[PDB]
């Protein structure tokens, strides 16, 4: 969803070499999300996204 | 005379086959008369098309064959059309070769490729109708090229060295595809075709400007360069004022050299018959214009 | 140490969204109906429409600001992989051909092994030299020059 | 490109850009007229900026232990030195995830 | 083997479909099992038999 | 000389008011970038080797960090960057 | 037996010119005849507000400066296609049954589809034209901040 | 096992163990080719460093 | 099949009569879309201080050949010529024409009044000469390329005096040199380079090919082809090999051969039938 | 990458730290902390 | 998860940014170790040499 308005092809190597960056990063900040982090507006963005 | 052609089956033709026939419009499909109606049996290369007759035989029995796109198709009835010279034409290729605006195509007997498949598509029980490759010009005069090399390369070689000459020469990569040659025989067209161009470099040979021959030596004592590093180790394996000057004799000399080149290259060069300009975003088709 | 110091120079591309204010009635358009032109051929018909729209500035000085917004990928590495001048460069040897073979063999340069048209047309103009990554985990491989 | 303010700044709006193609690997010189240009401020400006840079393994140590803005100060030791990232970027864009 | 002319020839319901990234990007990618794809006005599928 | 009501988020700032307008929904599902998803270039240098004057040497660290006594570390033959993910990257 | 459960289209959406906010930034007038022009001029009148000085001081005498605007051309195209088959099933209708009918309708409903999609082409151009004119008349922030 | 030279900052961030990156989501994919390049070949450089 | 151009400049009265007055006049442009900007309007997007006459030559043969026949306004239409049609076309180089005879399509060698310029580009059209000055030009000017490498003893500059000028029917052409400030630009040395190694490979390689062939049906034309090859050598010499090298070297000749292409086959593109005090025009079929 | 240390000496400085004294890496003459990404055994196991 | 145990790091570019912060007396079992400490899913303190 925060990539969708790149690609317009099948992904180029440095389109595909960003989407796994994203991937990465994503994946280990929010591996365990609720015993990690416990803010009320957090985790409501969080369900909302 | 025909600008239609009608081509029917004796088979009865199932609906598949229909649909096949159907998705097969705008392709291209030689015809051995150019002739009102023709029987199933004569289209297509599957005719002529005797593996142990190699590559070369083929070649020359398909580029005298003629050329015709598809049409109407229906039941049991097929409609060829025969493209005239000049007029803006749909076809549709069929080959995995990759078609870039602004090529020249040229018609071929088909490679082989990775997927090893060869589709055995539309066999009529025995009759399969095999479509020739539609191929852009590098490609096409690479094969030609790559062609006369090995017959001109193979001869008085054990079959030892010739492993690894083929097995390196036979594999041809165009913008990043894998094909290979798929019968390399010599036949008697091939030795009448070596016999040309062994007659013409013997005339390049001799009727040359006798400043050419070292013109390369007189700028490799001028320059040092990649290309020229090249091009003296090419001659390196067998390794001023002139006293007179002419120019009427280098212009008959230099007339005769481009008679003999030319009769040396279309030895390679191929007759194009399609020049592109369309391109679908997924090379499964292009508009062309037509050259006879 | 050599004896001198060596200063980069890099370039690093950045994917960005703009946000760009304009005035009211900033520039008039003024544009006519479609016109359409025909193109027949045997299997379809193309028709080409055009439009021919222009547009008259009426700003005394400057009606619209554009704004870099938000960033949210780098489009390069931001490595440290430096410039290949051989590449740049194709046409230059030494003088002497045992000196230039092992100066390519000591910078990992692949010397050319056999002519073929592509290297005669680099030679000559340029091409495609330098090849696509093997993996490429991270993105495009940043022009690090040297001076 | 000397000319007025004026003339100068929307001069650089309108071909003082850069162009790379996107995709290959590497930056080669895009074909004409292919995709968007590539705006270049420091083209405009004719400066090159600083990225955060250092000579031995301590300093850039420290600066990944200093987890409060340390990237931004450019201090040094005996013929050893780190050069500060001007522009807060680093941070900036590892905020995104 | 899908008959995709039947498809474009029967009358469709009209759904606002739509999703987060590209209509082709998701098809060069793979997303769907089967697809079907021409550049252009296409007369195969006027063609009964 | 006719208006037609239509309806669209207003900003107010400043005694004006302005209209806001997502054009992304102009852009969906075709081939044509969207024009205000521009590309950036910026340029970055960075010395390496450089020496420092031991006439005017200083330190403004040695309560943080301290190395050893080797000649590898007096001259700067090296020097350290980012990646674009935060790891170290070494350059000689 | 084999089960279809149904036939889906994509009802897109539709888009216009003078229905979005961009066209406040703009000023639209329709000109039929503008392929005989090859040139747009514009007057202005920009009458200068000035002060009333002291003794002696010089100051400007003009009133009204009249500067002259030049249009900048930008046309736009988009190319819509049909086949023979179409146009055979169009125009040439068969008196016969049904199916002919299916036909006529087909072919009736893809030139349709393909006019409404044209003409949303051409709106979309001309929101893609202005804004392409508009970023590249409008300078970034800081210098027009620091003006 | 592992050289005693081994750079002690590539345990410092999420790596591959094998001393050597093949997150393939990176590579052309059905490329095998390109793929079996990126992970044995030691001609050409590794990825992530 | 017609193409509208759009100039991005400003023109004016006398601007657009100059445009005009080339009224029926070649143009070619890269590639035929509906619709074009003037930057792709003839020869000025390829030339550069560096390259030199001989690319103009084969891009021109790549290039889509292009008719043009009005001006509208800010818009110029353009009309590709078909085969088999016949059309109206204009004299615009040097020489005069004369009915059934074939041309050709040539970059300019020689020129003012042609000159539209806008913003520091200008019109520059290609030249319509018959196939024999086509030839000719193509091959003095390659000639003078090997002069070139000498070019410092006395009879090779009065030789290249004498190149430099060619005499057609009822004109006179004083044709450039190919070489500035004594360096002879790039793929020009490169064609002749090209061209020479491909006659000093085939003097070696044509020995060892001949006995090759000569194992096979023997004949009369091997003959005389190795005693050809015998006196080659004698009047040359009086100044086992790995299959690698071999192949090498004849995929070298193959490829040197394939760059040479260009300029050997001068192809026609018209032909005219019409004799004219009114020589600036005349009516031609189409080939290509 | 998990917590581990070369030494008893680091380990009782990292007992000793504060919330998010994990993360940090640093290094002695010959000894060394490599750093965890995740909080884990922070605060993720026990969190009470 | 991985680790590495017994690494040896350059002396020649040897360095410290924890004088301020611990001291080891001068002995080569601390300048070379050959242990690696860790932590169990307790927080107890683990060895593995």
């Known amino acids: 969803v925060e990539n969708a308005t790149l690609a317009r092809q099948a992904l180029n190597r440095i389109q595909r070499s960003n989407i796994l960056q994203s991937f990465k990063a994503k994946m280990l900040a929010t591996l365990f999300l609720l015993n990690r982090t416990r803010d009320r507006d957090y985790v409501l963005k969080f369900l909302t996204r | 005379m025909e600008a239609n052609i009608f081509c029917t089956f004796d088979h009865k033709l199932s609906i598949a086959d229909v649909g096949k026939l159907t998705k097969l419009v705008a392709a291209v499909v030689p015809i051995p008369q150019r002739l009102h109606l023709i029987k199933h049996y004569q289209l297509g290369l599957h005719q002529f098309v005797d593996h142990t007759r190699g590559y070369v035989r083929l070649r020359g029995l398909l580029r005298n064959m003629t050329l015709t796109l598809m049409r109407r198709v229906e039941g049991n009835q097929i409609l060829l059309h025969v493209p005239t010279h000049g007029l803006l034409y749909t076809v549709l290729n069929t080959g995995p070769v990759t078609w870039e605006k602004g090529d020249a195509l040229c018609v071929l007997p088909p490679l082989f490729h990775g997927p090893l498949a060869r589709e055995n598509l539309l066999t009529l029980g025995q009759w399969e109708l095999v479509l020739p490759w539609i191929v852009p010009m590098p490609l096409a005069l690479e094969i030609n090229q790559r062609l006369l090399i090995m017959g001109l390369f193979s001869l008085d070689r054990s079959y030892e060295e010739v492993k690894a000459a083929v097995q390196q020469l036979q594999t041809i990569t165009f913008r990043d595809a894998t094909f290979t040659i798929p019968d390399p025989v010599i036949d008697q067209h091939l030795l009448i075709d070596m016999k040309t161009a062994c007659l013409s470099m013997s005339m390049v040979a001799n009727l040359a400007s006798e400043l050419t021959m070292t013109y390369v030596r007189k700028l490799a004592l001028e320059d040092s360069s990649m290309l020229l590093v090249k091009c003296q180790e090419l001659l390196m394996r067998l390794d001023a004022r002139p006293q007179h000057v002419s120019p009427d004799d280098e212009i008959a000399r230099l007339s005769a050299l481009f008679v003999m080149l030319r009769q040396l290259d279309d030895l390679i060069r191929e007759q194009v018959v399609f020049t592109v300009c369309d391109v679908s975003p997924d090379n499964k088709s292009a508009t062309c214009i037509f050259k006879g | 140490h050599p004896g001198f110091a060596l200063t980069a120079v890099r370039t690093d591309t950045f994917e960005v969204d703009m946000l760009l204010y304009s005035g009211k009635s900033c520039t008039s358009v003024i544009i006519n109906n479609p016109i359409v032109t025909k193109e027949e051929r045997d299997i379809s018909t193309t028709y080409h429409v055009t439009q021919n729209i222009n547009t008259v500035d009426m700003g005394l000085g400057y009606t619209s600001n554009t704004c870099v917004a938000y960033v949210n990928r780098v489009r390069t590495d931001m490595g440290v992989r430096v410039q290949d001048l051989f590449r740049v460069f194709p046409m230059n040897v030494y003088r002497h051909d045992e000196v230039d073979r092992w100066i390519r063999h000591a910078a990992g340069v692949e010397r050319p092994q056999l002519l073929d048209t592509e290297t005669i047309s680099m030679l000559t103009f340029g091409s495609m030299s330098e090849r696509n990554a093997a993996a490429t985990v991270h993105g495009q491989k940043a022009a690090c020059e040297l001076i | 490109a000397n000319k007025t303010l004026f003339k100068t700044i929307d001069e650089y709006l309108l071909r003082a850009k850069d162009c790379i193609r996107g995709d290959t690997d590497t930056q080669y010189v895009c074909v004409e007229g292919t995709e968007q240009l590539i705006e270049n401020p420091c083209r405009l400006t004719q400066e090159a900026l600083p990225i955060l840079s250092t000579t031995t393994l301590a300093l850039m140590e420290t600066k990944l232990k200093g987890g409060a803005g340390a990237f931004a100060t450019s201090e040094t030791h005996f013929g050893n030195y780190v050069v500060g990232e001007i522009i807060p970027l680093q941070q900036s864009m590892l905020f995104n995830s | ?49 | 000389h006719s208006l037609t009501p239509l309806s669209m988020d207003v900003i107010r700032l400043g005694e004006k008011t302005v209209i806001m307008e997502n054009l992304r929904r102009v852009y969906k599902n075709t081939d044509t970038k969207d024009p205000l998803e521009r590309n950036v270039d910026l340029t970055f240098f960075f010395p390496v080797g450089l020496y420092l004057p031991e006439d005017r040497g200083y330190t403004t660290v040695e309560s943080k960090v301290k190395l050893n006594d080797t000649v590898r570390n007096a001259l700067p033959t090296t020097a350290y960057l980012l990646n674009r993910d935060r790891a170290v990257q070494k350059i000689d | 037996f084999e089960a279809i459960f149904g036939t889906f289209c994509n009802r897109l959406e539709w888009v216009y010119f003078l229905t979005s906010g961009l066209a406040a930034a703009a000023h639209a007038i329709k000109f039929h005849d503008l392929n005989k022009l090859t040139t747009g001029k514009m007057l202005f009148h920009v009458q200068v507000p000035r002060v009333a000085s002291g003794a002696g001081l010089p100051t400007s005498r003009q009133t009204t400066i009249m500067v002259t605007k030049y249009s900048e051309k930008s046309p736009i195209t988009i190319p819509f296609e049909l086949s023979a088959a179409c146009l055979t099933y169009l125009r040439e209708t068969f008196e016969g049954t049904i199916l002919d009918k299916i036909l006529n309708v087909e072919a009736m409903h893809t030139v349709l589809r393909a006019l409404k999609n044209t003409a949303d082409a051409m709106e979309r151009g001309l929101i893609h034209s202005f804004l392409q004119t508009l970023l590249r008349k409008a300078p970034p922030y800081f210098v027009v901040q620091t003006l | 096992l592992t050289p005693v030279t081994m750079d002690v900052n590539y345990f410092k961030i999420p790596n591959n163990p094998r001393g050597r990156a093949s997150c393939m989501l990176a590579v052309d994919p059905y490329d095998t080719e390109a793929a079996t390049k990126a992970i044995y070949d030691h001609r050409e450089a590794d990825a992530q460093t």
């Open chain 5, 1 to 49: 083997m899908e008959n995709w002319s039947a498809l474009e020839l029967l009358p469709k319901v009209g759904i606002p479909t739509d999703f987060l990234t590209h209509v082709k990007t998701s098809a060069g990618e793979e997303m769907f099992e089967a697809l079907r794809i021409y550049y252009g006005d296409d007369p195969e599928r006027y063609n009964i038999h």
